[PDB]
Design a protein around this nucleic acid. Structure first.
Ligand code: HG
Ligand code: HG
Ligand code: HG
Length: 552
DNA sequence: ATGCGCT
C-alpha cells in the first residue's frame, strides 16, 4: 500500500514529497499537536502532571491542531506503514511519540526515519537504514517539560500571595530578567573616571604630516587624570626633541565570520538594518516558506559539503582564484543560508523589500564566509621625545578578499629609524570612562545563547514575556529594569538560589542527557528535583522570620 | 479568578 510519512514543517514536507513523488503521502504535524493544559488536587488538575503520583500526566491536543490531528487520522487508513520523520533531538522524538499515541495502531505499523538533506542522496538513505523511536529520548523531554511546569505553576502562586497577582516565575524567564536587573544596578552604580590623552602633530624631514599619540612617560603608561597633570606634560613635550625609534611594517589579515544562526542573524539584522528580533524572524519565516533559505531556527553554524561546493563554485566563477581558498574555510539543523547561491536578493520580486534586505544579509555572510582573507600592510611607528614615547599606526589595504562581497562601509609617511621630527602642535583631550551598555533585544538574546539559556524558537518569545509581565521595559530600543523586576529577582534569589543560578539550565541538560543515555531513570531524576524544589518552596511559604519569602 | 518552555 501507500506509505505515510510525517515531518514537523509543512514546507519541508512539500519538498520531501517531491524528491519521493507519489506512492507515498507526506504530511506535517506543524508543531507538537499535544501538550499539557503536601499535594492539592486542583493544583494537579491545573498542572496536568502529578508529582505525588509517579508523575502521571494528562496530555491533550492543542486547541488549534484539531484539524491537523483529524486530517491525520483518516490518512492513517490508506497507509500500510507509518514513517515518523521528525527531528532526531528529544523534542522531535517526543512529537513522534505523541503522533504514535494519537493515531493509535500497532507498534509494527510505525517506523522512525531521519532525513539528512533534501538531496536524493539523503531522502533515499532515509528509508534505507531506519529504526524506531527512542523511549529514553522521549522520557528525557518529558522530564524537562515537567520540571518547567512544576516551577511555573508552583512558584508563581507563591508570588501572587507574597508580592502581587498576575506575576510569574520560570527557569528561562526569571534569569533573563536577572540579567537585565544586574546590568541596571551595574549602570546606576557606575562612576565615570576622568582621563586625558595627548596627541602631537609633526613634520617628517621631508615635510609630510604625521600624527602621534603619547603612550609612555618615564616608561609608564601615559594617563593623566586631570588638566593640571596634562599641562605639566604638554609643557615638556613642547620643548622636546622628537626622533623615530622604530618602524615596524608587517602583513596583517582580516577573516570573514561564520554563516548565521538564529541569534547572530537577529543581532546582524538589528545592527545593520534596525530590525527588531520579532520582525527579523517574521521576514526570515517568509523567506523560508518561499524556499529561499533553510529553517530560521537553528543553533548550528554548520554547512553541508554540497552547500560548500555550491558556494565555492559560485566564488570561482564570479570572483576568480585569488578569492577562492585552496581548500574550504574551517571554523568551530544546518546554518542559515540561501538555498541556492545563484539567487540574488534583487530577483525576489514576490517578497517585501525588508525580506530582500534580510536575504541579502544572509547571502553575503554565506559567500564571504568561504572566501579568502583580506590583506593589509600594517605600520607601527615608535617615537621618542625626552622621557616620552609616542606612537602612530597605519594600514593600507592590499587585497579585499571577502570584503569584496561584504564591505565595511592610514598612510604613514616614509621615515626611517633615527630621523628627526618637527613639532607643529600638541592637542590635549579630556575623557571619561563610560558605563556598561544597556541591553538591546538582540543583545540580550546574545547573552542568553552564550549561557545556553534559551532556544532559537523561544528567544523572541522570551523578550516579549518579560515586558508584558512588567519586569523590564524597552525604550530607545534598549532595556530598562522595572522596579517589579528587581523585587521579584531579589525574592527569587533569596528563596530559590539554585533556580536563579544562570547555569541551572546547563546542569539540567546534563541530567537530561543521562536519561537519554540510559545512565539515569527519568522519574527518579524528577523525584530528586522535586524533593529539592519542595524543600525550597515550603521554606519560602513560611513567615519572613522563619526564612520565608519577604512580602512587598 | 491562574502560571511555565518548546516546536
Ligand atoms: Hg505550539
Ligand atoms: Hg567562515
Ligand atoms: Hg506556536
Amino acid at each position: 500500500g501507500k506509505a505515510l510519512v510525517i515531518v514537523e514543517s509543512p514546507a519541508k514536507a512539500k519538498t520531501i514529497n517531491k524528491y519521493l513523488g507519489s506512492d507515498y503521502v507526506v504530511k506535517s504535524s506543524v508543531g507538537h499537536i499535544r501538550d499539557l493544559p503536601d499535594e492539592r488536587g486542583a493544583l494537579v488538575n491545573r498542572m496536568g502532571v502529578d508529582p505525588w503520583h509517579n508523575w502521571e500526566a494528562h496530555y491533550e491536543v492543542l486547541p488549534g491542531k484539531e484539524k491537523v490531528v483529524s486530517e491525520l487520522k483518516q490518512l492513517a487508513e490508506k497507509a500500510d506503514h507509518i514513517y515518523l520523520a521528525t527531528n532526531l533531538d528529544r523534542e522531535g522524538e517526543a512529537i513522534a511519540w505523541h503522533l504514535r499515541e494519537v493515531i493509535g495502531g500497532d507498534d509494527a505499523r510505525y517506523s522512525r526515519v531521519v532525513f539528512n538533506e533534501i538531496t536524493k542522496n539523503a531522502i533515499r538513505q532515509a528509508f534505507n537504514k531506519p529504526g524506531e523511536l527512542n523511549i529514553d529520548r522521549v522520557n528525557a523531554q518529558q522530564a524537562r517539560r515537567f520540571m518547567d511546569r512544576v516551577v511555573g505553576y508552583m512558584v508563581s502562586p507563591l508570588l501572587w500571595k507574597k508580592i502581587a497577582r498576575g506575576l510569574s516565575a520560570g527557569r528561562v524567564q526569571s534569569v533573563a530578567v536577572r540579567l537585565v536587573v544586574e546590568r541596571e544596578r551595574e549602570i546606576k552604580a557606575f562612576v565615570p573616571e576622568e582621563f586625558w590623552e595627548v596627541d602631537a602633530s609633526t613634520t617628517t624631514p621631508s615635510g609630510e604630516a604625521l600624527a602621534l599619540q603619547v603612550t609612555h612617560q618615564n616608561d609608564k603608561p601615559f594617563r593623566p587624570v586631570n588638566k593640571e597633570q596634562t599641562q605639566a606634560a604638554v609643557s615638556l613635550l613642547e620643548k622636546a626633541r622628537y626622533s623615530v625609534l622604530e618602524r615596524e611594517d608587517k602583513p596583517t589579515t582580516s577573516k570573514p565570520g561564520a554563516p548565521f544562526i538564529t541569534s547572530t542573524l537577529q543581532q546582524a539584522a538589528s545592527t545593520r538594518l534596525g530590525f527588531g528580533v520579532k520582525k527579523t524572524m517574521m521576514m526570515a519565516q517568509r523567506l523560508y516558506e518561499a524556499g529561499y533559505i533553510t529553517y530560521m531556527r537553528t543553533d548550528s553554524t554548520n554547512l553541508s559539503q554540497d552547500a560548500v561546493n555550491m558556494v565555492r563554485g559560485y566564488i570561482s566563477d564570479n570572483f576568480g582564484k585569488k578569492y577562492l581558498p585552496e581548500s574550504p574555510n574551517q571554523y568551530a539543523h544546518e546554518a542559515i543560508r540561501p538555498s541556492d547561491v545563484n539567487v540574488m536578493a534583487e530577483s525576489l520580486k514576490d517578497m517585501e523589500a525588508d525580506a530582500q534586505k534580510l536575504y541579502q544579509l544572509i547571502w553575503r555572510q554565506f559567500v564571504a564566509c568561504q572566501m579568502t582573507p583580506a590583506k593589509y600592510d600594517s605600520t607601527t611607528l615608535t617615537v621618542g621625545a625626552g622621557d616620552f614615547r609616542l606612537k602612530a599606526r597605519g594600514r593600507i589595504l592590499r587585497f579585499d578578499g571577502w570584503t569584496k562581497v561584504m564591505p565595511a562601509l592610514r598612510i604613514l609617511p616614509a621615515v626611517n629609524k633615527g630621523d628627526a621630527l618637527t613639532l607643529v602642535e600638541l592637542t590635549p583631550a579630556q575623557h571619561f570612562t563610560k558605563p556598561p551598555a544597556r541591553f538591546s533585544e538582540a543583545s540580550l538574546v546574545k547573552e542568553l545563547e552564550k549561557r545556553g539559556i534559551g532556544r532559537p524558537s523561544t528567544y523572541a518569545s522570551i523578550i516579549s514575556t518579560i515586558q508584558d509581565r512588567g519586569y523590564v521595559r524597552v525604550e530607545n530600543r534598549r532595556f530598562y529594569a522595572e522596579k517589579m523586576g528587581e523585587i521579584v529577582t531579589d525574592r527569587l534569589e533569596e528563596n530559590f538560589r539554585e533556580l536563579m543560578n544562570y547555569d541551572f539550565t546547563a546542569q539540567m541538560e546534563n541530567s537530561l542527557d543521562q536519561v537519554a543515555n540510559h545512565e539515569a531513570e527519568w522519574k527518579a531524576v524528577l523525584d530528586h528535583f522535586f524533593s529539592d524544589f519542595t524543600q525550597q518552596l515550603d521554606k519560602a511559604e513560611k513567615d519572613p522570620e522563619e526564612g520565608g519569602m519577604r512580602p512587598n
